[PDB]
Design a protein around this ligand. Structure first.
Ligand SMILES: N#CC1(CS(=O)(=O)N2Cc3ccc(Cl)cc3[C@H](C(=O)Nc3cncc4ccccc34)C2)CC1
Ligand SMILES: N#CC1(CS(=O)(=O)N2Cc3ccc(Cl)cc3[C@H](C(=O)Nc3cncc4ccccc34)C2)CC1
Ligand SMILES: [Cl-]
Lengths: 299, 306
């Protein structure tokens, strides 16, 4: 029993974190085989090709623990800088670079000066920001998931927006969202609630014994989406309904029956009650996260 | 900016997790140097759990009855001893991944990270607090026994908890790494229940200071309170008494924000009376009590968003 915001074990990623220094900027890098990946703003209206051409390999100081790595090459891929080093990381795990979609969750290993500080779980918001916890020096910290024994790196931290939320790129340097890596006027767009995730968390509450919100009613997908659009909830698709199939079979509550419960919660509130110790509807657990935590999958 | 329930990086602990088997029971062990620590109930059957005599059950076992597996490698047990509710299995190989570590016993209100494991393999990491009633609100399934709680302030791991059982209310009970239980619990399936739980007042105040540091002040008021009047009100909402030690401990956060501890207590009294009125504090509609004053200072900026 119990339901916690759970992150993946971070050890395989901790063994890849390094400190990258160029000029007065110090930030974090990800050392995989003989390449260090880091935000291209470590070299800083920036013209990154003009700034980069003026740098020599020895301008980049890379430190792994108490060991200095020597940079032997450099190249830029989108908003990510790739520093070729003479030493392959002996701790390189089995890995992939994957781009995630809004609504998907991942673990963040927050680092400062190449040293891991903490691990937390978060979701890519529908507005492409993440509600992280990052201070100055956290740039280059990474987000990941683990599948079997393989680390899928999905996020690299680049900046904080004026509302306190965060923006970054995939490991190929493509930003999530309409953001740019420059000190300019930027803002997160209006965010929405991840409906499929709220439904997954309601199934998790049922599995753990919280059933007060269940009712005898059902709804159609069309009527549910009309109500959900009114409450700034993301539209629920047939793919979301299919994805929730296993949880619907385990609890005996059809997805549209759980949608009827969610409509009543949106229209009436909780009335002094809580669900899994929360007075808000939680949207940062995917259907897969719920199945994984209620089954004990290991890595 | 931001404020998350943040766990310590788990790598140093992952390299210590092993699987321990005795007969038909399998659970997790912590391998530090040449010793594997695990719950002594690994020697019990489910029948034994009503009134087990651990001394009598243990004397019938030899070293080769304990199977210890680290990854895909079988470790050889060369000795065994019981210390309180933990079994210590001497092995013929010292763990080459043993981090710098200490065994620390914590007090209620303290937080720690839990690395939940099954079959000696880490599954996930989350942040927890030792409740005032000595239980923890964890997330554990069958096979999670032997999973550990820890803190890593600096590069030294301080192990503070080892998981032993789930009580009927769904909450969890365990021991320190010397095998002494937290709370009035026994590693016996007897009618024991968690006592009435209370809110960790000093932690709620720490989290209100975290909200101020992150730029929010809507909940502040023009009042102050005496410590005794605060405690008289707090007890009515099932909040733990606030002591002078707690007031002293909150001194640094008070100095950084410019809000006196008793002035923050007055704000808490008003939040208990009025609720949040559709508002949130650090993304929560409830008063959060699983961040200590130390956790707030570690995570938050040293400069307040005035
Ligand atoms: N709005 C805002 C702020 C960011 S900034 O203006 O100082 N900043 C502009 C900028 C522009 C583009 C790029 Cl790619 C990076 C960056 C940097 C960046 O965000 N860094 C950080 C990242 N994360 C967490 C931070 C917390 C605190 C200060 C910096 C933080 C620097 C003040 C928070
Ligand atoms: N009430 C209750 C329950 C526990 S039990 O009755 O199966 N159980 C009695 C018991 C008594 C004392 C001792 Cl020391 C160990 C133990 C064991 C124990 O707690 N194991 C576990 C531990 N953690 C999380 C579990 C989740 C699910 C099933 C077992 C879980 C076995 C059913 C939840
Ligand atoms: Cl303590």
């Amino acid at each position: 029993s119990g339901f916690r915001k759970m992150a993946f074990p971070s050890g395989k990623v901790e063994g890849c974190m390094v400190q990258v220094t160029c000029g007065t900027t110090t930030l974090n890098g990800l050392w995989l085989d003989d390449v260090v990946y880091c935000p291209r703003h470590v070299i800083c209206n920036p013209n990154y090709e003009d700034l980069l051409i003026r740098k020599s390999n020895h301008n980049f100081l890379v430190q792994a623990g108490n060991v200095q790595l020597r940079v032997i090459g450099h190249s830029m891929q989108n908003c990510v800088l790739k520093l070729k080093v003479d030493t392959a990381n002996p701790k390189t795990p089995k890995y992939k670079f994957v781009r995630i979609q809004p609504g998907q969750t991942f673990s963040v290993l927050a680092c400062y000066n190449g040293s891991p500080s903490g691990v937390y779980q978060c979701a890519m918001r529908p507005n492409f920001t993440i509600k992280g916890s990052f201070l100055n020096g956290s740039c280059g910290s990474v987000g990941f998931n683990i599948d079997y024994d393989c680390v899928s790196f999905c996020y690299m931290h680049h900046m904080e927006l004026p509302t306190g939320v965060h923006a970054g790129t995939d490991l190929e340097g493509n930003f999530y969202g309409p953001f740019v890596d420059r000190q300019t006027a930027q803002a997160a767009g209006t965010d929405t609630t991840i409906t499929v995730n709220v439904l997954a968390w309601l199934y998790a509450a049922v599995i753990n014994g919280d059933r007060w919100f269940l009712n005898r009613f059902t709804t159609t997908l069309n009527d549910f989406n009309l109500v959900a659009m009114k409450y700034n909830y993301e539209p629920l698709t047939q793919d979301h309904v299919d994805i929730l199939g296993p949880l619907s079979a385990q609890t005996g509550i059809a997805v549209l029956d759980m949608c009827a419960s969610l409509k009543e919660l949106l229209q009436n509130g909780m009335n002094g009650r809580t669900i899994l110790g929360s007075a808000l509807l939680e949207d940062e657990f995917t259907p897969f996260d719920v199945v994984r935590q209620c089954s004990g999958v290991t890595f």
